[PDB]
Amino acid sequence: MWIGIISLFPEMFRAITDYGVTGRAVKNGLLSIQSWSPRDFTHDRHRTVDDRPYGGGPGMLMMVQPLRDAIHAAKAAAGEGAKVIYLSPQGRKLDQAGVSELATNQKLILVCGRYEGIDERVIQTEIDEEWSIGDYVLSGGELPAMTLIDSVSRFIPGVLGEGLLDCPHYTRPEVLEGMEVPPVLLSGNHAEIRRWRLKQSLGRTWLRRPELLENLALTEEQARLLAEFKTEHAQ
Ligand SMILES: Nc1ncnc2c1ncn2[C@@H]1O[C@H](CSCC[C@H](N)C(=O)O)[C@@H](O)[C@H]1O
């Protein structure tokens, strides 16, 4: 996987380039990242990158020419089949399934807005798809870009060595403040353990995200474990 970045603050990406799973993938070559900043495509003395919006409005928009030039340069480095993504609260809402679709590309170019955004005609001319990390607003496309890169990298084979929320987890000591590790975790029974996990997963998804379960086709075993969870919950 190759990733080109267009952003006014390339340095922010160090958060993904130098730490954890992501930094190691990068140091090992599973992942590469280059960035072109619109600031280096500026022609004026003040290096201008924002511009006024037609029709009035609150903020600024990214100046079009320095933005397009930065995008063109990433396009030139990357070539054919490099999907251009614009991070935007107006794009498709990201979820594990879309992360899957994205992880399927070998080359991506991510476009990071600042201010109130980018010119509609640049989106229509330069971008293949818009993606949002969630129904809320950030002041930049960097975190969203890094978020996209992080979740997707987890699918590349050397990076790490289905409907429900995960179950609770436990690790040393066996009793922490009078609270014990559920005894099944301590038995060695592979299936009694797997059963407790699926059951806790079903119950948590019910308690916290009942709507995920409605989009799930449960097996009879899952229905029984849920029904069983719901019952020992009324106690
Ligand atoms: N939830 C979210 N997902 C992805 N990008 C987001 C985001 N919130 C903000 N951004 C990024 O940061 C910028 C500033 S906020 C922009 C909101 C503007 N009303 C909209 O039309 O664009 C956008 O250009 C976007 O790239």
Residue 67: CB within 6 Å of ligand 1?
no
List alpha helices for 79-133, DSSP H: 96-103, 120-126
Our mutation pick for probing the ligand 1 site, out of 60, 88, 116, 119, counting the most ligand atoms within 8 A of Cβ, is 88
Name residue 107's beta-bridge partners: 2
| Two tokens, residue 69 | 């030039």
Q: Torsions phi, psi of 155, nearest 5? A: -90, -10
The method recorded for this entry reads X-ray
Closest CA to 96 of 142, 155, 32: 155
Structural tokens at position 173: 């000591």
CATH numbers and ranges of domains, the chain: 1-160 (3.40.1280.10), 161-235 (1.10.1270.20)
How many whole angstroms from 182 Cα to the centroid of ligand 1?
44
| Residues linked to residue 84 through DSSP beta bridges, in sequence order | 109
Counting other chains too, the contacts that 162-166 makes at CB distance below 8 Å and 24 or more residues apart are: 163/205, 163/212, 163/213, 163/215, 163/216, 164/201, 164/202, 164/204, 164/205, 164/212, 164/216, 165/201, 165/204, 165/205, 165/208, 165/209, 165/212, 166/201, 166/204
Q: Which atom of ligand 1 is nearest to the CA of 112?
A: 26
How do 2-6 and 32-36 pair as beta strands?
parallel
Looking at the DSSP bridge assignments, the partners of residue 92 are: 131
